[PDB]
Amino acid sequence: DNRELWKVLNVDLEKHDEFLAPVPAVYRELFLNRPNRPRAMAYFDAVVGDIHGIRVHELYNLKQEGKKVFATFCVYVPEEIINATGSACIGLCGGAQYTVPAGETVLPRNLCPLIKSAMGFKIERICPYFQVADYVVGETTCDGKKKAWEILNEYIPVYVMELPQKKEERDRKFWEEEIKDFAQFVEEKTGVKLNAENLRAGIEKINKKRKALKRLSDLRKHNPAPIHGLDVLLINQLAFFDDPERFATKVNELCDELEERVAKGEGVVSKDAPRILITGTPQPIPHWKIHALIEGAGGVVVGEETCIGERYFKDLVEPAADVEGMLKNIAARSLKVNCACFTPNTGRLEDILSMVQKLQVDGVIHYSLQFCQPYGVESYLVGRELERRNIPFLKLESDFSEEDQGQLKTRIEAFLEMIK
Amino acid sequence: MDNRELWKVLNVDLEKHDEFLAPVPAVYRELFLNRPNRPRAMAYFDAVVGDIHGIRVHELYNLKQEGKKVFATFCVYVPEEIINATGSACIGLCGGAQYTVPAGETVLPRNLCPLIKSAMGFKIERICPYFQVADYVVGETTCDGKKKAWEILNEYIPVYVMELPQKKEERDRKFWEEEIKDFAQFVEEKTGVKLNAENLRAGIEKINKKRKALKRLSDLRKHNPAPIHGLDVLLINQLAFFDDPERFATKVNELCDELEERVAKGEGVVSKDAPRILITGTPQPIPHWKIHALIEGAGGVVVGEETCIGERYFKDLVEPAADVEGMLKNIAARSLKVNCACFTPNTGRLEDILSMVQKLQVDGVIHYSLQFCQPYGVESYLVGRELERRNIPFLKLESDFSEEDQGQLKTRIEAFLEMIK
Amino acid sequence: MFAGLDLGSTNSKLVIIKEDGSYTFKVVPTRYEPVKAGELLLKNTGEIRNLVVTGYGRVAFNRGKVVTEITCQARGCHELFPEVDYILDLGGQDAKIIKKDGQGRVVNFLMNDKCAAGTGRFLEIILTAIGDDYRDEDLINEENAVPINSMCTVFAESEVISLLARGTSKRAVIAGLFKTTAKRLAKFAESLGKPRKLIFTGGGAKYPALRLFLQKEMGVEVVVPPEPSVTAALGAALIARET
């Protein structure tokens, strides 16, 4: 059962129990006791309820079959290539304050919580996913991650993809070559050669998952909102852990239910509630705080311009007949992601403005984690443009510590009061 | 009013510029002029400081009057050699002053590197005559804060962004070569001076000579007793980014001559037994003198700086090439030898540190990096760990441009000095 | 008759507007227990028709219409200074810059970032320790207003310790803290636009040297309500009556 699996993975059982102990109460308060949630949330509720169970069993069984488990922290790492071989790709961006002090044993305290928390999970041996992973694929995005990989490599082999910092022709070729080098790495480690059939199948599997999430995002444009944003965030978070085929089926089953709600004009709020767009950094599970506060004040979050959100699923791979072309197309897909580690990053602004209009947003909340300098600095020019377009804008920052609620509530609620 | 008239023509905010400048002479008096046993050849640089915003700014302005250009840079990777080949000037404008930090924070996060916030503020407030005279800013894709700040800075002065790779493998080396060739075209376009073998070799020799003079002074600090205080050499390395390369090189070489005379008589600035300290980490732009001032006011002597205002600036010289194409490739390779924490891994920087501990007879290494500097902040872990494995005393410090944390820094430094007595 | 209760981090304030349009006000320390402070303030109040509760303790008080201190401060300051569009409210834990329209409604606002929390409480604490057995009138022309880190109260506290540890004057440090705070708050109060005139309210406005330094830095007139502690509570009471 679960506890024997964690033992074989060399999980620190006591620290892990301590980490998981408060989670059911929080999930009860923020999810299960919230009314009018779609029936199709039951699958995702059960995933959270056994978050370190059945999926971790699946990954362990894949390794005993000779497959591998690749851990990633950025949407730029090509899931299509890993899944082509029948290995697993999981995303282990950290979202927990519990592990931050452990991360600070080797990292500066003035650093993104996402990075510190992930490092602490691996160091304390608290996470069964991090324990079952064979490899970490890092990328050269923000400063903290780039330099963290050097340290993390002492605990788990880290392969570091060099992502460039512009999107010119030279950059796109450089990234193409990085993608082909990574393809070779995967082949070597798995012993599974990429060919037209298995790469096509891997592309198809991940396009299906993205398409599912795109379908769910689109349904949020309706009025009244058919689903609270917090439920969608959760679903986008679990995209990084779940089986992609099952996950896509369950997302699509939810969309069918939401379509019926839309057809009957049913929603989770009244048509007068303020519709909010979140933009900024990803919110990894269980960093639910900002959604929870907005929707507990009577707002509804109707989209996330973030990598646990729109930036993850909006762009699909285009098909091609051979491996060479599919690999070029996989590189191109990821370079559509308008992350603030690129300069300039004007496409992200275009995305935000388009989402405001497609989602009929009453206000934009720009949320970035403390000490995330790419999104922290870029927030100035984003705010300046939304201001001159008369789009209400609130800039928020926090870390994973859950108890700064009062400060965040006053700022959020004053904003909602203002835009009513 | 020769200087104030020029500043008025540069649209300097004259009121704030005086208030910026008003406190500096007393500091310089205290940390430099009243300090005993300084080489006679410090007189030149002392004079530069005394008129820090005059002679040189006038020269730059006169250069613009003749159709040449002034390029402002913030990182040693930008090739001074290409700019200088055309006759145009290159100056480094990394910020070192708390005064402009609030101004920088009007457009930047407050928990960002002070180097960046101070530079942003100088331009926003129109405080700095050098920043006011500069035609262009050349920004590089190094740390997060600088790369994203350039996008904001472009609203105030045109910014050309060079993309530096993040590794040093063959594909990175070729990439950087292409960026250097792109930059060369930009300088040719803005100056109207097409580069050729003649003026590009000339540009290389001029900066190679400045680098060589700085290398020469660096090697002389290896002697015991130390012939010069590290604070004076920090100053010189700071002024290398403002001064005329030729005049600067000549005056550094004149200083080295006097220091050789000191070495030849066993003359030093401190006793034989004073702790010999290596600084490593981020650059310390003028007037960020605090750390050196505190180490040496506590009886130590700084004998080297493993930083870009220091060893990383002058260690590597361009190698000769016959034609323009080969010189551009060699310029590119010179700067790619700099072992900045923005590259991964950055194992050369650790080899340089060990090499300088041995050559400079160092008793302790003080790793100083600016608050919220994440590349050097993070890399500090592995650096201190390897110096620990090698039984090299190691002290990690951090601070910003605010001067009144002296008490905290003194206790840390002095306990370290006591530990390595 | 119409009540506004402002349960702040530091002080709790009650304004009562009577039928004849006049009003009374009471302030008591919160003592980290806003429920107790509100019951105490409402003790013996009389029959209340409408109540609005604001401040941090609004999340816990079990009756009254809830409204944020931003909206209340705008409304209250509008009652006093309809002709001034910008408001700086300095409390014990938060700083707020607010721009209001000709009806006193919020057009835009900004609160302190996380690293700027706690400015007012730090001023309260350090002034009690190193006293100010001088009178405010003397900090204004200090020759040495030593500059003190503006980053946060942790960095500032460090510098205060080192400065007094080496013998710097008490007054010079006090002057330095007020000037640094004023310089930071001057930039802050320009975040929504350059005010032609500024209302400075909240308890932090009760430091006359802070107001003078702020006004000199901003270069425009800074008006302080006759009782800056209660302006947000007045706004709550006005909203309660309007409601």
Add this chain to the structure above:
Amino acid sequence: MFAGLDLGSTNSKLVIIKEDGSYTFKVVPTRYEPVKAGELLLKNTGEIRNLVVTGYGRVAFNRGKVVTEITCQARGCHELFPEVDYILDLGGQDAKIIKKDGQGRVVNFLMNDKCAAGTGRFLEIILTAIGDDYRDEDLINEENAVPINSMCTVFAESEVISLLARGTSKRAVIAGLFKTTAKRLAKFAESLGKPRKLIFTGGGAKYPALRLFLQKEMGVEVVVPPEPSVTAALGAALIARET
């Protein structure tokens, strides 16, 4: 007699050792004026033949041999526990982890970063503000300590205000502050190598709950001097005798 005078951020402490080898101590608050405190302390103590002064006030107090508090602390802790190689000193503004050898010599040390400054003073402030009607008996019996941000005292204060504002029990908050402080200090006390045994000293070691919570995080034996306040001053006095 040989005297050691530790002029710290928060308290100033005096140790006098006779020829016998017995010693007396005296402690007074620094009140931001180290010279005064040292003057007050040394009065009527009898003439001193050697003096070592340590702490923030050491320079300004223009008497004696000046030695840093890192070296003094190692000395005075070595007298009491020569078999323990590691020392955690928590004062009012600084935290320090010290590794000494079998002879008492400091072989490595580490002091808190800037954002970790002022931990001790914050605990004193907070305990005062929230008082503690509660007995220290309790914080160990606390089944629902609330984790508080470990970044710095600014972020921790913000959370304390939020928790009490919404009705969290002071006991849950106080227990959470010590626990979180213990967790960070435990990791901090391993920066120099993981000790098999730890000395915990300074005024911070006087909080009973911090001792227990620290030991439980460390997972190894913790020993606390009889008078943690004065061990740095004893080190200074032992150095005055030796010098």
